[PDB]
Design a protein around this ligand. Structure first.
Ligand SMILES: [K+]
Length: 207
C-alpha cells in the first residue's frame, strides 16, 4: 500500500511509522508545515501505526527526544511511541480486506484525518480541540492529553482482564471524537476497505 502523510499543521511534526518490531519504510521524518511524505507499506502488514511527534530535537546521528510520541529517542522509529499519541492504525490484505481506524486509547496529541485515496470505503477523523478541553488529571505538561490507563494504571482503565466498561475519561474522548476508539472495548469504529487500498494521513486537517 502507498500512504501519503501530510502535515497541514502550522507547526512542524516528526511523523513516525512502525509495526512495533520494525520501521515501516524509513520509520520517521521531519515534516514542516505543508510537507508530504509518501511511504510504501508491504502488503499483509498487520498492526501498523502512523503518528505525529511534537517538539523534537535530533542530532546528526538521528538520536534525541520528543515531548510527545518519542520512540526510544530515534528519528527513524522501530518501536511504538510514548503516549500521548493520536494513532492511525491499519492491517492490510487480511483475507482480501484492509482494516483501518483512528484510536485515542493512547491519548491524543495532534488532530488527524485518515482517508482512503482509492474507491470503496470512507475515511475517519478526529479533529476536535481535545488538548484545550482535556481534563486536568489527563493533561500532559509536554503537550497532549493522556489516556486514563497511562495516568492511573488501573485494571478498569487498562482493560487488563478483558472486561471493562466505558469511564468518565473514555466518554470525554468519545464525545469529542466519536469515530475514534476511546477505550479497549469500545464498539469498533474500524473501517473495512478493499484489500490493497491506498491512503492519506493528514495532520491538522481543518487547518
Ligand atoms: K484540525
Amino acid at each position: 500500500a502507498t500512504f501519503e502523510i501530510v502535515n497541514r499543521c502550522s507547526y512542524t511534526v516528526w511523523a513516525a511509522a512502525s509495526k512495533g518490531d520494525a520501521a515501516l519504510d524509513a520509520g520517521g521524518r521531519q515534516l514542516n508545515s505543508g510537507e508530504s511524505w509518501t511511504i510504501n507499506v508491504e502488503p499483509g502488514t498487520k498492526g501498523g501505526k502512523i503518528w505525529a511527534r511534537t517538539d523534537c530535537y535530533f542530532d546528526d546521528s538521528g538520536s534525541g527526544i520528543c515531548k510527545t510520541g518519542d520512540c526510544g529517542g530515534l528519528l527513524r522509529c522501530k518501536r511504538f511511541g510514548r503516549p500521548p499519541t493520536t494513532l492511525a492504525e491499519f492491517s492490510l490484505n487480511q483475507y482480501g480486506k484492509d482494516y483501518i481506524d483512528i484510536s485515542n486509547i493512547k491519548g491524543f496529541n495532534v488532530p488527524m484525518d485518515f482517508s482512503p485515496t482509492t474507491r470503496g470505503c470512507r475515511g475517519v477523523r478526529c479533529a476536535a480541540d481535545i488538548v484545550g478541553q482535556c481534563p486536568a488529571k489527563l493533561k500532559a505538561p509536554g503537550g497532549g492529553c493522556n489516556d486514563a490507563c497511562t495516568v492511573f494504571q488501573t485494571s478498569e482503565y487498562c482493560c487488563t482482564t478483558g472486561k471493562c466498561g466505558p469511564t468518565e475519561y473514555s466518554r470525554f474522548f468519545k464525545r469529542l471524537c466519536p469515530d475514534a476508539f476511546s477505550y479497549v472495548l469500545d464498539k469498533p469504529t474500524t473501517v473495512t476497505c478493499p484489500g490493497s487500498s491506498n491512503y492519506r494521513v493528514t495532520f491538522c486537517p481543518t487547518a
